[PDB]
Symmetry: D2
Subunit: 237 residues, 4 copies
C-alpha cells in the first residue's frame, strides 16, 4: 500500500471531494483525520467506512479559518496517531457575484476560509512535517478559465495557486512537497449542460476523479513533483 | 496626437514609486489624473505639481481603497473634477514577507484588504462610469510567476489579482471594457542603474537572475501602463504582462 | 517624437495581412522598413508605396526565409540600404489544418520549415547586426493557449516559436537584445467589423470583446514591443485575441 | 494491478527514462513493446528484467513513417491490442543561435516532433475509450535555457501537440498528456558543472533519476488519471 504507516488530515471532508479523498487515502493505508465544518454525520460515516474496511480514522469538528481550530485539527493527528505525513487542504466554500454585487462579507468569508484557512492549517501542520511529507491544496480550474461573476472565488483560488508555488520553494530544502489540484465542476441545470459541452472527455466530474489524483500526489509516486497545479476537469482549461 | 487626449484616469497608491510614475506618464499622453494616496499627501502633491508644471492636469485625493466610502470618493473625484472616467490603474498595494511559521492574522488581513479588496471596491465604484474603450489596469507582481520563499501572503494577494483580472476581462468584455494586469519585477529607486548601485543582497540575487542586466525602475512600468491604457492595446484583455527585464 | 526615429526594421512576410500592417505601423513611428515577401511582389510594392507616400522609408525584398541564403540577403538588404538594423519582426508563416489521421510529411515539413526554421535562420542572420536596445518580435498564435482540434502541426510550430522566444530572451539578454512574441487570435480582412463563415461566427461568439481581430490590432502591439516603451519586457508572449485564451 | 490486460508501447526505451517507464508499466500488468533506436542489448536487457511480465523488443526510428507503423503493428500482432502510448524517443543537441545549422534543426525536429506525430498517427487506429497517450516533453518549455533554441523548440511543439490532441481525441475518450522532466541523471567537466548548477536550482535538493519520471507515467497511463487530459506535468524536483 502506497501510504502504509502514514497519517493524513483532510479538511472539509464530511461530503463530496473531501470525503472521497479521505477514503482513497485510507485505501492506500493512511490513517485519516476527517475534519468537518458542517455535517458531523457525514464525517462519522466516512470514519465508519474507513474503519469497517480495516483502516484507522477519526472525525474532528472545526473551522479552519480559526487559528485555534486549525491547531486542534493538527493536534488530533499527533495525539491520536503520533505522526503526520499528508495534509489535504480541501476546506473551501464558494459564492458567485458580479462586480456590482460584491459585498465585504462575500469577500471576507471566502478569503478567510479558502485562503487564511489553508495558511493556518498548513502553519500548524508544518511543525510536524518532515522529509517525504506531502501537502495537497484543493484549488479549482477557475484559475485557468476565470468565469464571469467569480472574481472573489477565483481570487481565492488564484491565491491558493500562488501559495502552493511559494511553499514548494520555501519547504523544498525540508523535502516537503506542496502541490495543487485544480478540479473542474464535480457533481455529488443550465450550468451543468454548459460545462458538459465544454468538457472534452464527455461527462461531468465525480469526487473520485479528484480522489485518485490526491492519492498519487500524496504517495512517493509524486516524489519528484512540487509546486505543480494539476487541472482535473476532463480537459477543460 | 496624444494617446490619451481628452481622457481621465485614476491611479491608486500614486504618491511614490510605480504609481507616481504611472500618473506622470498617463498625463504626458494627455490624460487628466486623479492621484490617490493612502497617507503621503506630500508625495501626491509633488506628483501633481510635477504633472501641472509639465502642462498636464491632476488632483490629489487621500483615501483607503479598502474602505468602500473612500473607494467611492476617489471615483467621485474623477467625475467631479473632470466630468468622466476612462482609465483605472489599481496600484495601491502593500507588501510584507514572512515564512509560514511567522504568518499572523494581521499580516494576512492587511495585505489582502488592500491588495485584493481595495482592487475590487475601487473597480466596483469605477465601472458605473466606464464605457466602451475603457481600460482597467491591475498592478500585480512577477511573484505570481516566481513565487519566492517567505512570500505566501504577498504572492497570494497577487495570484488573486491575476485571477480577478481574468474574471473581469470576461465579465466586462461585452461592455468593451478591457482589463489587464502588469506584473512588475523588483523595482528600485529611479537613478539607481545610472549611479551604479547594487543596494542589498536581495537586489544582487534578483539582478543575477535578470537577463537584461539591471533592476527595473518606475518608468519601466509606467510606459507599459500607458500602452495598456491606450487604444494601442485595444485587442488585449485578460493579459498579465511580466515587466521584470526577463525574470520569470 | 517618433518612437522609432532613425531605427531600421525588417518585417518578414509583409506583402499582406498582419505583416503589411506591422510594416506600415513601424514606419509611421519613423522606422525605415525592409519589406520582405515570399511570393507577392505587388503586395510588397504597394506596402512600400504606402510608406513612402506617407513620408517614411521602405524597400521590398523577395525571399524565402526557410532558405539560409535568402534569410541572409534579407538582412543584408537592411544593412546595405540603411546602414543598421534594430528591429526584427518574424511574421512569415503559413498554416494548414488537418486531423492526426490526415497528417502528411509535406504538411509537417512545409509548416515547420517556414514557421520555425525560417524564424531561426532570419534571427541568426540578424543577430550579427543587433546591439543594445534591439528588439526581436516573433509572430506566434493564440493556438498555443487554445490548441484547437485538427491543428497539431500548426500549433506545434507556434509552440516551438513560443519556446524559442523564451530561450532567445535569456540567451541574448546579456547583450540587451529583447525577444518577445505576439500571439494573435484569428485575424480577418481589414474592414470586416465595420461591414458587418461558420468558423468565424464560432470564434466571434468566444471572443469577449465582440468582434474579430484585424491586422492593425496586431500592428499596434508590434510597435509597442519594438519601442523603448517595452524596454523592461523580454521573453513575453502577448495574446492579442480580444480576450480569447 | 493498474494496467492488467493492457498493452503499452514505449519509444526510445533502451536506456534512461524510457527503460524505467517500460519496467514500471509492466510492473502494473501491462505488456510492453520496448522500442529502441539502436541499443538492442539495452532493450533486450529491459525485456529480460520484465520477464514477472510480458515484453518484446523492437528496433526502429520513429522519424521514419514505416518504422513507426511497424512499432505499432508489433503491439497488435504480439498482444492483440493497444492501450498506452509513451512517446519518449528523443535526441537532444544544444547550440547558441549563431551555431544553429539545418542538420541540427532537422535531426531534432524529425525525431522529437515528427516521430511523435507518426507514432501517434499509427497508434490511434487501435485506441479506444480509456486509452492514454503520454508525451515525454521537458522542463525546458518552462525554463527555456540559453543555447537550447532547437531542443526547447521541439519540446514546445510537443506541449502544443499534446493540447491539440487532448481536444481532438476527447470525443473518443482517449487521454493525451505530457510529462516535462527536469534533468535526469542516467560528460566530463561539462556534465559535472551542469549537474551542480541544476542541483542548486532544484528545490527538493537532489538530481532526478529515471524512476522519478517512470512513476508519473504509470499514473498517467492508469485510470487514476481518468479525469486529466491536455495537462503537462513538470517533474523536476520543483524547478520551473
Ligand atoms: Na483563461
Ligand atoms: Na482549453
Ligand atoms: Na514558477
Ligand atoms: Na525563467
Ligand atoms: Na488551453
Ligand atoms: Na479563457
Ligand atoms: Na520561463
Ligand atoms: Na520557479
Amino acid at each position: 500500500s502506497k501510504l502504509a504507516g502514514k497519517v493524513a488530515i483532510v479538511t472539509g471532508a464530511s461530503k463530496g471531494i473531501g470525503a472521497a479523498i479521505a477514503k482513497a487515502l485510507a485505501d492506500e493505508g493512511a490513517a485519516v483525520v476527517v475534519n468537518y465544518a458542517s455535517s458531523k454525520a457525514g464525517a462519522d460515516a466516512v470514519v465508519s467506512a474507513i474503519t469497517e474496511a480495516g483502516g484507522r480514522a477519526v472525525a474532528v469538528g472545526g473551522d479552519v479559518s480559526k487559528a485555534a481550530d486549525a491547531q486542534r485539527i493538527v493536534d488530533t493527528a499527533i495525539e491520536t496517531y503520533g505522526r503526520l505525513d499528508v495534509l489535504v487542504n480541501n476546506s473551501g466554500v464558494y459564492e458567485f457575484a458580479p462586480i456590482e454585487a460584491i459585498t465585504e462579507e462575500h469577500y471576507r468569508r471566502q478569503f478567510d476560509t479558502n485562503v487564511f484557512g489553508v495558511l493556518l492549517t498548513t502553519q500548524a501542520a508544518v511543525k510536524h512535517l518532515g522529509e517525504g511529507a506531502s501537502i495537497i491544496n484543493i484549488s479549482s480550474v477557475v484559475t485557468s478559465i476565470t468565469p464571469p461573476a467569480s472574481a472573489v472565488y477565483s481570487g481565492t483560488k488564484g491565491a491558493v495557486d500562488a501559495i502552493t508555488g511559494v511553499l514548494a520553494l520555501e519547504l523544498g530544502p525540508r523535502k516537503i512537497r506542496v502541490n495543487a489540484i485544480n478540479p473542474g465542476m464535480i457533481v455529488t441545470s443550465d450550468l451543468e449542460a454548459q460545462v458538459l459541452g465544454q468538457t472534452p472527455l464527455g461527462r461531468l466530474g465525480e469526487p473520485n476523479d479528484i480522489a485518485s489524483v490526491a492519492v498519487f500526489l500524496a504517495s512517493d509516486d509524486a516524489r519528484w513533483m512540487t509546486g505543480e497545479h494539476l487541472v482535473v476537469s476532463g480537459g477543460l482549461n
